[PDB]
Nucleic acid binder design. Structure first.
Ligand SMILES: [Mg+2]
Ligand SMILES: [Mg+2]
Ligand SMILES: [Mg+2]
Ligand SMILES: [Mg+2]
Ligand SMILES: [Mg+2]
Ligand SMILES: [Mg+2]
Ligand SMILES: [Mg+2]
Ligand SMILES: [Mg+2]
Ligand SMILES: [Mg+2]
Ligand SMILES: [Mg+2]
Ligand SMILES: [Mg+2]
Ligand SMILES: [Mg+2]
Ligand SMILES: [Mg+2]
Ligand SMILES: [Mg+2]
Ligand SMILES: [Mg+2]
Ligand SMILES: [Mg+2]
Ligand SMILES: [Mg+2]
Ligand SMILES: [Mg+2]
Ligand SMILES: [Mg+2]
Ligand SMILES: [Mg+2]
Ligand SMILES: [Mg+2]
Ligand SMILES: [Mg+2]
Ligand SMILES: [Mg+2]
Ligand SMILES: [Mg+2]
Ligand SMILES: [Mg+2]
Ligand SMILES: [Mg+2]
Ligand SMILES: [Mg+2]
Ligand SMILES: [Mg+2]
Ligand SMILES: [Mg+2]
Ligand SMILES: [Mg+2]
Ligand SMILES: [Mg+2]
Ligand SMILES: [Mg+2]
Ligand SMILES: [Mg+2]
Ligand SMILES: [Mg+2]
Ligand SMILES: [Mg+2]
Ligand SMILES: [Mg+2]
Ligand SMILES: [Mg+2]
Ligand SMILES: [Mg+2]
Ligand SMILES: [Mg+2]
Ligand SMILES: [Mg+2]
Ligand SMILES: [Mg+2]
Ligand SMILES: [Mg+2]
Ligand SMILES: [Mg+2]
Ligand SMILES: [Mg+2]
Ligand SMILES: [Mg+2]
Ligand SMILES: [Mg+2]
Ligand SMILES: [Mg+2]
Ligand SMILES: [Mg+2]
Ligand SMILES: [Mg+2]
Ligand SMILES: [Mg+2]
Ligand SMILES: [Mg+2]
Lengths: 267, 46
RNA sequence: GCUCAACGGAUAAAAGGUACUCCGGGGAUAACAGGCUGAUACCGCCCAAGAGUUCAUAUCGACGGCGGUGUUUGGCACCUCGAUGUCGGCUCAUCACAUCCUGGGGCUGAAGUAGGUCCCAAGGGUAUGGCUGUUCGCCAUUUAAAGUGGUACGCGAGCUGG
RNA sequence: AAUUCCUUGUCGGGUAAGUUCCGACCUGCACGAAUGGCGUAAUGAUGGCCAGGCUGUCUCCACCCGAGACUCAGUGAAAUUGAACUCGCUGUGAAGAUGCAGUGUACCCGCGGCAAGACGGAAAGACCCCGUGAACCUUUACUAUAGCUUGACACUGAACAU
RNA sequence: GCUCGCCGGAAGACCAAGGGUUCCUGUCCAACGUUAAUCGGGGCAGGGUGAGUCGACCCCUAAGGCGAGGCCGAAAGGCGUAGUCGAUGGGAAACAGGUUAAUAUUCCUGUACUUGGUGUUACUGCGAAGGGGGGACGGAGAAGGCUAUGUUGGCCGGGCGACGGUUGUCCCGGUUUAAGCGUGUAGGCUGGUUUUCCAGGCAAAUCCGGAAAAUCAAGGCUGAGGCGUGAUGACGAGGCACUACGGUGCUGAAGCAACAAAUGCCCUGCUUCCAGGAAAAGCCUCUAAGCAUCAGGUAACAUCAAAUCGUACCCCAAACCGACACAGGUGGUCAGGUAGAGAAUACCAAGGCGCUUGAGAGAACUCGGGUGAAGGAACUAGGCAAAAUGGUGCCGUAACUUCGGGAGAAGGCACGCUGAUAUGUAGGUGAGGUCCCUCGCGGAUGGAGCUGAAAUCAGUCGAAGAUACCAGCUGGCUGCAACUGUUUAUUAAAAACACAGCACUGUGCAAACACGAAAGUGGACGUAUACGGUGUGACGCCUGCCCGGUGCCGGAAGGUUAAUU
RNA sequence: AGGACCGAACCGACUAAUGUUGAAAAAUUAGCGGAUGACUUGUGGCUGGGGGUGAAAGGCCAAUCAAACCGGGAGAUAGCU
């Protein structure tokens, strides 16, 4: 914590750690545009991505891209959205249609917010990269000019472009190094999502952790047959990967597809 | 304690009972292994 | 043309773990206890340089010598591997004598009192605790004394399970 | 010290007496910093030690109330079992004898009780060894192989430049 | 048949699951009942489960299954679009008495209700596989009101008492009564309404969504219980006749008020919180194509229809899962009195039982208990097991501490009954009388009756008053692991696994990684504050030196080097 | 408020005795731990054997698990009894 406002520290009286509340989202619950979405940890056959049980789901919610151009929206209120801590926004277009957006930073009431070409550079709506200044303030881009995915993880995520980087390809995702991309693609330009979120510590397993993910921790736990390294008196030695894949360093994804980008880390 | 069995006649046929048999490949054989091969008066139920 | 040297030479090419274990066999083969043996051990005796003020033998005894027992440490591998359950404790014992107490004697470097040692003697008797799984041991405090040993290192179709 | 073999280390404390315990020392056989190091309030059907209370846990067992055990009537099992006319002792002996030898003792048969022997009952010993037995596991053992990864050819064409 | 004892959050009652005649009657006693058996869940006969409203069918969909064509794959076959199945969930309607040897919201009586067709009447725009609304949904907590229901009184019927008193102050019993119909209340929620305009709802739409204006407010939905009606009926203690001994026909009094409750109902509510809480149909509504004096729509009533299966009995057990008439296992519902915090526990109601060998005896020894002199852990591996503590209120409480705790630390004192204060008090409940008004299950003021704790004095009984059942032993030092949790079903519950936190590493999304010959799927309808893998395991102070070896990361100039030519 | 505290139902199994041809192929008796939660339970569904599932014990996958059960290759092989 360091900014406004003051984040509770949860007064330990039961072995309980701080949480991170907001203020409100004036309506404890959604609207009419949301699905149920089933929920598994099996792939229409076996386990896979082992670990993942928790409970209570539903609540799909949606909309991205923001193809709806030159037609303004008003933000009725912020709101919730599970598994993806990054708020959400709601929005109303002058014609009575209601999407959901993705709450960037400061916003709340009214707020212009409009997509289109040369709409209005600030932190409002989407906008083809073909028209973006410093863009030191860009949001969820589109790996393809039409989709609308990329970093729907608005939770304080960045993609600072480079202002007027011509050539028709640039960008600079967060820690994901840099990677050139088209320009017809659009970006919310809000460039935020309230990072203060992802800062309080879950708490103490069950009390909040268990709700979603299971005991992902397995360690060696011995039993030289279940894991590549196990057994022994009380210790383990030897290499320590997982299914002769090697866990330390390595790297994967070969000849994949694009593979046209750059910079990246190493160590 | 709780012996390994319990009841349920509605959960059984959905594992054995010609619709459960004939629906499966080798399953149609199970009836032939008895009816055709053998001579079972009747064998397919809970 | 081969340290095929594991040298009559299984392949051209071959390391380990199992207390997670499994099967076929063996008392043809180890572990416990029995048995054979007694080197070792323990017990005794023979010689007598020495010590004992003096004096070999009250007491002890060098260098060496002969045995008794079956009891220690061992050797063997005869009896059990189609099962003979380990140590210690509890319970309850039974025998030996190389006797711890009590009984009777000899010598004494035995005044007395108490002892030392050897002979005889098995009737009876022969500790509670602290520490430890202990047996044992050391320690506290008793006692006339707190014996050594055999009995599958007595005793689980009798108890315990440290 | 959940790590120290020597080991009951040495000193201190608690005790009448403490191979355990607590506090030290350091000589760490063979601690040690995320196969984490030193602390840590709280929690613990967790290991170790001390105390108060409490008492039959014990000195040392007594009485009593019930369910069996015993007796009668009814019903009515079990494992085991080569055959029995199925005593002790010392010796013998495939090496621990009811059955052999010598000898001692013993009228025939039940009922209730006890567990010293019938190497008592039960499971073709699980320990040990062996079989050119088995299984699962390990790896820089051997030989392979899925997967990953390299390259050529190919589905794969047209232009230009150096 | 009379005693006696046992259970009673059940050892009672009901149902699901499962069972599949075990139900009732008559019979018979070989086998089966751990004995006898005239008896039975045994044998042999018969009889016995009656629905428009309960359930299944049936509409609807969840997980998931199947799957035209389709995509994959040597064959078998895998996946899956439309779509079609699939409850454990959503859709419509009945109650109370009576009756059978055994059926029962199914039969009878009394009183109702739902939906569809057809018809009559009246008024009218009807119409989807479509749009909108609605169904429709979390956890936790805090009330208020109410009912179930109990208690006391009143009323009615009955008795005056094996022994001292009770013949009006008293003892016993009863005091019940449904849906449906009218009433729209304690509360809950939400501004109505009209007009016009439109880049939205795949087309349209008056509907929903958006925008403006304009006029008023006192509305409109929802809703437990209560009160009328149902019902001068039924039921009803109890009498009278008949009895087969089980029971039968008739008759039939009072049938109210006050207080006290719920975990049930208002409550799919209200408040609040983070982990942010199915779907589809019915239902309402809007229009499309189409219809176009028609058909259809709404309402009233008249009538016809509501098919077919299940229904017996066991159901925490002698009918199910355990080979048994097995001290085990098995989901839901109901929830009386005294005492009590209470679904604890004890004694009891209604109700159900004494557990299918018994009769004596009164040894050792075995099991389960009671009491023990003096001692008091000397026992022992170890206080194992016992014994012990045990309640409410109040006083009072250490190191240490993450300031929460440690803490019921420890250790104490009072508790019964009676009188009084006060004939029942404080509190709770709330009756006419009175006051007023749109108006009424109105409001206000009045405080009768009803109910009723604690405390304080004073007195009294016993050895003892938290008297029984029930019901922490406490403290001190030290190891380990932070803590709740998890584990070897059937010898290990731990210091082990997990945990939140920390770190390394990988992954740019057709992600890494995993399942899969593939298609495809999971990861994720997520996208680096994200996902995976590895190790450490709160927190505090920290985490030193070594890159020689192996592994991994970068470079890749030069050496060596495959197929290929 | 709380993986908060005492404690029934419910869930679980730390201790001792009994049972060990049992009432019982893991229970009974007296104590014992959790008891709004990583809780507990009904119904139905999905993962298949070298495979599943696993808060990890080689645990569980129908009284069976260091590789389930059934049928087959099969009269496997057995220098052993
Ligand atoms: Mg392990
Ligand atoms: Mg492995
Ligand atoms: Mg040779
Ligand atoms: Mg192991
Ligand atoms: Mg063997
Ligand atoms: Mg031999
Ligand atoms: Mg020997
Ligand atoms: Mg022998
Ligand atoms: Mg002698
Ligand atoms: Mg001693
Ligand atoms: Mg012995
Ligand atoms: Mg025994
Ligand atoms: Mg032991
Ligand atoms: Mg120490
Ligand atoms: Mg270490
Ligand atoms: Mg650690
Ligand atoms: Mg002899
Ligand atoms: Mg006996
Ligand atoms: Mg034997
Ligand atoms: Mg053998
Ligand atoms: Mg029959
Ligand atoms: Mg009957
Ligand atoms: Mg019968
Ligand atoms: Mg399919
Ligand atoms: Mg359907
Ligand atoms: Mg259903
Ligand atoms: Mg009946
Ligand atoms: Mg009288
Ligand atoms: Mg019935
Ligand atoms: Mg059985
Ligand atoms: Mg019986
Ligand atoms: Mg006493
Ligand atoms: Mg002692
Ligand atoms: Mg002792
Ligand atoms: Mg105890
Ligand atoms: Mg007791
Ligand atoms: Mg220690
Ligand atoms: Mg722990
Ligand atoms: Mg715990
Ligand atoms: Mg176990
Ligand atoms: Mg255990
Ligand atoms: Mg660890
Ligand atoms: Mg380091
Ligand atoms: Mg709790
Ligand atoms: Mg118990
Ligand atoms: Mg509790
Ligand atoms: Mg199930
Ligand atoms: Mg099993
Ligand atoms: Mg087989
Ligand atoms: Mg063959
Ligand atoms: Mg054979």
């Amino acid at each position: 914590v360091k900014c406004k406002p003051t984040s509770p520290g949860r007064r330990h009286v039961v072995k309980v750690v701080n949480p991170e509340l907001h203020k409100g989202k004036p309506f404890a619950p959604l609207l009419e545009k949301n699905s149920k979405s089933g929920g598994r940890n099996n792939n229409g056959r076996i386990t896979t991505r082992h670990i993942g049980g928790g409970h209570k789901q539903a609540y799909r919610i949606v909309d991205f891209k923001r193809n709806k151009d030159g037609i303004p929206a008003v933000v009725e209120r912020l709101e919730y959205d599970p598994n993806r801590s990054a708020n959400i926004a709601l929005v109303l277009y002058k014609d009575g249609e209601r999407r959901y957006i993705l709450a960037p930073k400061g916003l709340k009431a009214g707020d212009q917010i409009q997509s289109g070409v040369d709409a209005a550079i600030k932190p409002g709506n989407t906008l083809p990269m073909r028209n973006i200044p410093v863009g030191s303030t860009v949001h969820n881009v589109e790996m393809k000019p039409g989709k609308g995915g990329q970093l729907a993880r608005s939770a304080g995520t960045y993609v600072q472009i480079v202002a007027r980087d011509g050539a028709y390809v640039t960008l600079r995702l967060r820690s994901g190094e840099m990677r050139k991309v088209e320009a017809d693609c659009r970006a919310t330009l809000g460039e935020v999502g309230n990072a203060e979120h992802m800062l309080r510590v879950l708490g103490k397993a069950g009390a909040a952790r268990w709700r979603g993910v299971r005991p992902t921790v397995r360690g060696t736990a011995m039993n030289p047959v279940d894991h590549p390294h196990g057994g022994g008196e009380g210790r383990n030695f030897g290499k320590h990967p997982v299914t002769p894949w090697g866990v330390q360093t390595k790297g994967k994804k070969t000849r994949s597809n694009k593979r046209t980008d750059k910079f990246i880390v190493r160590r | 304690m709780k012996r390994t069995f319990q009841p349920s006649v509605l959960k059984r046929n959905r594992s054995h009972g010609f619709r459960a048999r004939m629906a499966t490949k080798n399953g149609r054989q199970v009836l032939a292994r008895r009816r055709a091969k053998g001579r079972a008066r009747l064998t397919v139920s809970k």
